[PDB]
Design a protein around this ligand. Sequence first.
Ligand SMILES: Fc1ccccc1-n1cc(-c2ccncc2OCC2CCNCC2)cn1
Length: 305
Amino acid sequence: MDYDELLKYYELHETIGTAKVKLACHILTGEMVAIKIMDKNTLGSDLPRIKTEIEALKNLRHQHICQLYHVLETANKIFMVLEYCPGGELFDYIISQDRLSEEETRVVFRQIVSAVAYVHSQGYAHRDLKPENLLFDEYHKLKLIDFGSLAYAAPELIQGKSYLGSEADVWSMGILLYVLMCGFLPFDDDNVMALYKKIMRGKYDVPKWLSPSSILLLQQMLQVDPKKRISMKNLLNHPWIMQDYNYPVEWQSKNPFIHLDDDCVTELSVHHRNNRQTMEDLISLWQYDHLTATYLLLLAKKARG
Ligand SMILES: Fc1ccccc1-n1cc(-c2ccncc2OCC2CCNCC2)cn1
């Protein structure tokens, strides 16, 4: 029952994560995708919250956000077809490299900043930023996933205090910045209570390989008082961020909802019995059905060249 409708559009390959994640092939275009499979019965009470997260993803379209292509709902399952990221997790990348240089950290950090600033510009907050939530695509560009961990959580978030998601994101970004340049967490312990004490105290070791500017940026992000944390606006053109670039982080989306690609509308129209204008009208509704999937995948096929 569960897989019948999905199997009309996708050829399923192997599981890569357990929500379960499967690699698949889009039949029409031949494009690889990742399929997030969610058991509705397993979620039960947390199900309406997963539905609000899907709706938020429908409103996020960005070069550094893993793209939603298709949402399929059955009696027992929710399927989310997503952008294929074969480079894997930034978590695995950090471990394989041990730690990144200041220069390579900047390449990756400016991409995280671009995604997160855009998420905030859309009225959302991520709240679970960590290197397991950042994937590399075939072009080695980062893609943010799993919208909506203890080692990355802001002191106020752990204490159960009221918080602004934007300030909790800036703290988690400070933790990511440290891990990128150090290869280990600033706050860590085998005991959960001792880790909780360490986060709230906000004291961490400053390794010898960190430059004075890196150290100052970490201080500006890793403030226990959320009001003392740097705002996203000042992070876009921060002196550490501008070093070797001399231009602020481009956070604005390059992936439109409005403008449609004429080649992709043309390619798409041959598979349907409608005229071009009807086709453009249908695509513009952005229903996250097979039509949305096909259009976005043709665009991804085109960008490859
Ligand atoms: F990760 C990959 C490796 C090789 C080929 C493709 C991928 N890929 C994963 C996704 C993906 C997209 C949206 N949400 C979750 C996703 O994966 C979660 C798993 C959890 C276990 N670790 C690996 C990533 C997209 N492409």
